[PDB]
From a paper:
Seven antigenically distinct botulinum neurotoxins are produced by the bacterium Clostridium botulinum and they share considerable sequence homology, and structural and functional similarity. They are produced as inactive single chains of molecular mass 150 kDa and released as active dichains, a heavy chain (HC, 100 kDa) and a light chain (LC, 50 kDa) held together by an interchain disulfide bond.
In addition, we are also reporting the crystal structure of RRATKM, a variant of the substrate peptide, in complex with the enzyme. The final refined model contains 423 residues of protease, 6 residues of substrate analog peptide, two sulfate ions, one zinc ion and 375 waters. The substrate analog could be modeled unambiguously in the residual map (Fo-Fc). As in the case of QRATKM, the P1 (Arg197) amino group and the carbonyl oxygen chelate the catalytic zinc and the nucleophilic water has been replaced. P1-P5′ residues occupy identical subsites as in QRATKM. While P1-Gln197 makes a hydrogen bond with Glu164, P1-Arg197 makes a salt bridge interaction with Glu164 thus making it more strongly bound. The IC50 of QRATKM and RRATKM are 133 and 95 µM, respectively.
Author numbering:
A (entry chain A): 1 to 423
B (entry chain B): 197 to 202
Write the structure that this text describes.
């Protein structure tokens, strides 16, 4: 069975359930936007993201001598219904490609179960949802109803290639780092991809290569989904914790520091830059956070609202955090179970492992240099499929990653900008 | 995040 049971068309009439006009909790004003619920707890908004951050509502590019090297602007991208239809279909197709692998099925299952914790109440004797982990859906009668959700895929903001995982913060709680979790908004586009070089010495050099091979967009989305997994379970590493790259002369002369959260997400050898001691520090830190959630759950006596029963919610979080329950019914965190879950989310779900499952060529490290951005169209089956990506079986593109070779499969890629030599 | 500033 498919991850997305319905093949939505952007123009399909709204129904107030899985096709509806919605508003997000940006703590500001906005006109409702058309959205599609593609799976339990997951929505797609085919719009440029001018909502999550009020200071980023301008899609227009600054003057030429003001733009960052690695960036791409086009204020008109994703403004027409045809584009939105293709965006919806492209994102859906990538979710299917990801779900078709055992690793992808595992990651998506973890994401759906990762409901943001109900820790919004001010009194420890009752559990209450945090409204910023919900969206407001316009019902058939014109009224709004609050719906909890775990993930939203939305178009990029001004800089089209700056894909990232975003979420609304709390006045006092660090939701992505206190075990609670929060609704994740992933800025992403299936309509562009990036080039990389097949030789490591070239890919990690800022002056060489034009970007001969194209990254499979399913890997790019998986990368953001991995971050979402960490953030939904509240175990993301503080961005202030970074690796002062000293293994790349070019990075060094720029004094560039890369966050541990990114190295962990890529996995492979990159993850090894995080030493054992710091690794243990974080593990214990989050163990203590899961413990506090257990203590808060015990002090809870009632539930706020009538959408679900306390028994239901207390159990939903017992399954999310895989807690244990004694005779009296008190909750506790088990070391073996915590370590297993923590390891699954941080070591099993990595970019490097997804590359193995998709059988594609990909950058070998996160510590490299971008080469170029290409326009693509993965919707037509003659171009890309759920099962083979660009490397179509029984064609000349089947072997040696020929489908990702932009020189061989040139009809599937239009280079929009070169980054090499501009750093 | 897709990549560093590089
Ligand atoms: Zn990232």
């Amino acid at each position: 069975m498919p991850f997305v049971n319905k093949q939505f068309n952007y123009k399909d009439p709204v129904n107030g359930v899985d096709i509806a006009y919605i508003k997000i909790p940006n703590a500001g004003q906005m006109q409702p936007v058309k959205a599609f619920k593609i799976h339990n707890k997951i929505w797609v908004i085919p719009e440029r993201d001018t909502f999550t951050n009020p200071e980023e509502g301008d899609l227009n590019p600054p003057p030429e001598a003001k733009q960052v090297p690695v960036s791409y602007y086009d204020s008109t991208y994703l403004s027409t219904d045809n584009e939105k239809d293709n965006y919806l279909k492209g994102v859906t197709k990538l979710f299917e490609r990801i779900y078709s692998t055992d690793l992808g099925r595992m990651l998506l299952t973890s994401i759906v179960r990762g409901i943001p914790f109900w820790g919004g109440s001010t009194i420890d004797t009752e559990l209450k949802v945090i409204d910023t982990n919900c969206i407001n859906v316009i019902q058939p009668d014109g009224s709004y109803r609050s719906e909890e959700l775990n993930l939203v895929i939305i178009g990029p903001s001004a800089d089209i290639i700056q894909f990232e995982c975003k979420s609304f913060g709390h006045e006092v709680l660090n939701l992505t780092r206190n075990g609670y979790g929060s609704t994740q908004y992933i800025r992403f586009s299936p309509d562009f991809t990036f080039g990389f070089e097949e030789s490591l010495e070239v890919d990690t050099n800022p002056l060489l290569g034009a970007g001969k091979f194209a990254t499979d967009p399913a890997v790019t989305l998986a990368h953001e989904l991995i971050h979402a997994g960490h953030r939904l379970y509240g175990i993301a590493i503080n961005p202030n914790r970074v690796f002062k790259v000293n293994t790349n002369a070019y990075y060094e002369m720029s004094g560039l520091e890369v966050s541990f959260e990114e190295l962990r997400t890529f996995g492979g050898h990159d993850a090894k830059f995080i030493d054992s001691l710091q690794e243990n520090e974080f593990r214990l830190y989050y163990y203590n956070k899961f413990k506090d959630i257990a203590s808060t759950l015990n002090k809870a006596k009632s539930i706020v609202g009538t959408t679900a029963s306390l028994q239901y919610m207390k159990n939903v979080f017992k399954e999310k955090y895989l807690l244990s329950e004694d005779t009296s019914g008190k909750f506790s965190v088990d070391k073996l179970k915590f370590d297993k879950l923590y390891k699954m989310l941080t070591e099993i779900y990595t970019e490097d492992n997804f590359v193995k499952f998709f059988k594609v060529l990909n950058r070998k490290t996160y510590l490299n240099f971008d080469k170029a951005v290409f326009k693509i169209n993965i919707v037509p089956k003659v171009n890309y499929t759920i099962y083979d990506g660009f490397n179509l079986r029984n064609t000349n593109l089947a072997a040696n990653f020929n489908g990702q070779n932009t020189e061989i499969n040139n009809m599937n890629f239009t280079k929009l900008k070169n980054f090499t030599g501009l750093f | 995040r897709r990549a560093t500033k590089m």
